[PDB]
Amino acid sequence: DPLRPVVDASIQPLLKEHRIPGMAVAVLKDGKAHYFNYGVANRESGASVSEQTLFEIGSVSKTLTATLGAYAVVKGAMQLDDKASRHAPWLKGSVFDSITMGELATYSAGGLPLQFPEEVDSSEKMRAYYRQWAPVYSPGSHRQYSNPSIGLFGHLAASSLKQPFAQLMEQTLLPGLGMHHTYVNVPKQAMASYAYGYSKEDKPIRVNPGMLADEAYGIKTSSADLLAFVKANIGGVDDKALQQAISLTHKGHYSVGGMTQGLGWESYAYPVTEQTLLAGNSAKVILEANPTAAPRQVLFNKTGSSNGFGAYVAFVPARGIGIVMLANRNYPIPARVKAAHAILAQLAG
């Protein structure tokens, strides 16, 4: 493959610097998938990474949850300007009478935190958490990146379609997108393809179920499946409702600096500087409340991490280019962004 030198040149330094046990990289260009696989999925077995290896993609899950939400809209089961409580009887009476589904989706409901408090470890406690939550900001005025926010969005979109979220994803949406090895619950027959994550102390680890984990950060997938999702986000899919769903995930709702927030995907004018891409993926944007501003060739991306795992996806529909990078080390986001940026610049020519 004459792309191998270019990918290796950006990826090998990451592997060495962060002692990354394994990484699966997939690149799209001119309709063609290219797979570059490094290292091991499992340091005990020494099993090689391939484009079939399953990794935890963490928050990249949010792009798939967002697509489910968009699908519920397309099917007429909900609208982004629905009040959250329209789709959850147990939110009737709360501030979620006056927060919208779109606001949940785009982390703009008013300061829902990054994570549930540790004590919120059950259905009952989760419902009470949301019912007792006090808005920090007016709905729509601040982006506070939030698992409880988009997690609730995903959970209520599923409810709007009268099916459990895991079932909708695994039986309808993901097979619809061409993603047959993408799971919220990895089945027995796929467990042998499931990587272990590696903590900073090199302990093997995998995600634990937390409240709304499935919706907010729970997807396990391969580089091949995630590149098919990228393909679907560029070339489209056969099913028309799905196609229209995907399109909805591309539209800008608001901007923070040079990043534009959509459903799941975060977008930039392309060509995009390394500086701009780093800023919109900065700790500031991830961790703090930032005021929303009016929204924006376009690059779409999403970062994802779990304990022991680090993922990144970026693509540029107008140029037919895309990259997936899945590792079983949670290595720093700036390193993901710089490597992706240099590889995509080489593909774009």
Q: Verify binding: residue 253, Zn ion, rule CB under 5 A.
A: yes
Cβ distance 232 to 177 under 8 Å?
A: yes
Q: How far is CA 74 from CA 79, 156, 230, 235, in A?
A: 9, 15, 20, 19
> Which residue in the shown chain puts its C-beta closest to ligand ZXM?
59
Cβ distance 186 to 194 under 8 Å?
A: yes
CB of 221 to Zn ion, least distance (A): 8
Write down the residue that tokens 């900001």 correspond to: 137
Q: Verify binding: residue 217, ligand ZXM, rule CB under 6 A.
A: yes
Of 176, 225, 231, 309, the residue at the interface with Zn ion (CB under 5 A) is 225
Q: Which stretch binds Zn ion (CB under 5 A): 57-65, 113-121, 178-186, 325-333?
A: 178-186
Q: Which stretch binds Zn ion (CB under 5 A): 39-47, 114-122, 183-191, 274-282?
A: 183-191
Task: Give which of ligand ZXM, Zn ion, none residue 250 binds (C-beta under 5 to 8 Å, depending on kind).
Answer: Zn ion
Nearer to ligand ZXM, 52 or 307 (CB): 307
Q: Which stretch binds Zn ion (CB under 5 A): 33-41, 128-136, 220-228, 264-272?
A: 220-228
E strands present in the chain: 22-29, 32-42, 47-48, 55-56, 142-143, 197-198, 204-205, 220-221, 254-256, 259-261, 266-269, 290-291, 298-306, 309-316, 321-327
Q: Any idea how long the chain is?
A: 349
Separation between Cα atoms, residue 40 and residue 28, nearest integer Å: 23
Amino acid letter, residue 24: A
CB of 230 to Zn ion, least distance (A): 12
- Out of 10, 45, 59, 193, the active site residue is 59
CB of 253 to Zn ion, least distance (A): 4
Residue 212 in 3-state DSSP? coil
Q: Which stretch binds Zn ion (CB under 5 A): 66-74, 94-102, 321-329, 336-344?
A: 94-102
87 annotated ligand binder: no
CB of 147 to ligand ZXM, least distance (A): 5
Of 102, 111, 151, 264, the residue at the interface with Zn ion (CB under 5 A) is 102
Separation between Cα atoms, residue 80 and residue 235, nearest integer Å: 25
Half-sphere exposure of 175 (CA within 13 A, CB side): 6
Task: Determine the Cα angle at 128 with ends 122 and 131, to 5°.
Answer: 140
8 annotated ligand binder: yes
Task: Give which of ligand ZXM, Zn ion, none residue 107 binds (C-beta under 5 to 8 Å, depending on kind).
Answer: none
Binders of ligand ZXM among residues 291 to 320 (CB under 6 A) are: 303-307
Binders of Zn ion among residues 279 to 318 (CB under 5 A) are: 291
Cβ of 199: how many Cβ atoms within 10 Å? Answer: 12
Q: Assess whether 199 carries a catalytic annotation.
A: no
E strands present in 106-257: 142-143, 197-198, 204-205, 220-221, 254-256
Separation between Cα atoms, residue 150 and residue 138, nearest integer Å: 17
Separation between Cα atoms, residue 87 and residue 68, nearest integer Å: 15
Q: Verify binding: residue 34, Zn ion, rule CB under 5 A.
A: no
The answer, yes or no, to whether the previous bond of 291 is cis (omega within 30 of 0) is no
Task: Give which of ligand ZXM, Zn ion, none residue 58 binds (C-beta under 5 to 8 Å, depending on kind).
Answer: ligand ZXM
Encoding tokens for residue 312?
Answer: 């990144």
Nearer to ligand ZXM, 7 or 120 (CB): 120
Query: What is the binding site for ligand ZXM (CB under 6 A)?
Result: 58-59, 147, 217, 303-307, 330
Annotation: binding site? 1, 8, 18, 34, 44, 124, 142, 155, 180-181, 185, 201, 225, 250, 253, 272, 341, 349
Query: What is the binding site for Zn ion (CB under 5 A)?
Result: 8, 102, 175, 180-181, 185, 200, 225, 250, 253, 291, 349
Annotation: binding site for Zn(2+)? 1, 8, 18, 34, 44, 124, 142, 155, 180-181, 185, 201, 225, 250, 253, 272, 341, 349
Which residues belong to the active site? 59
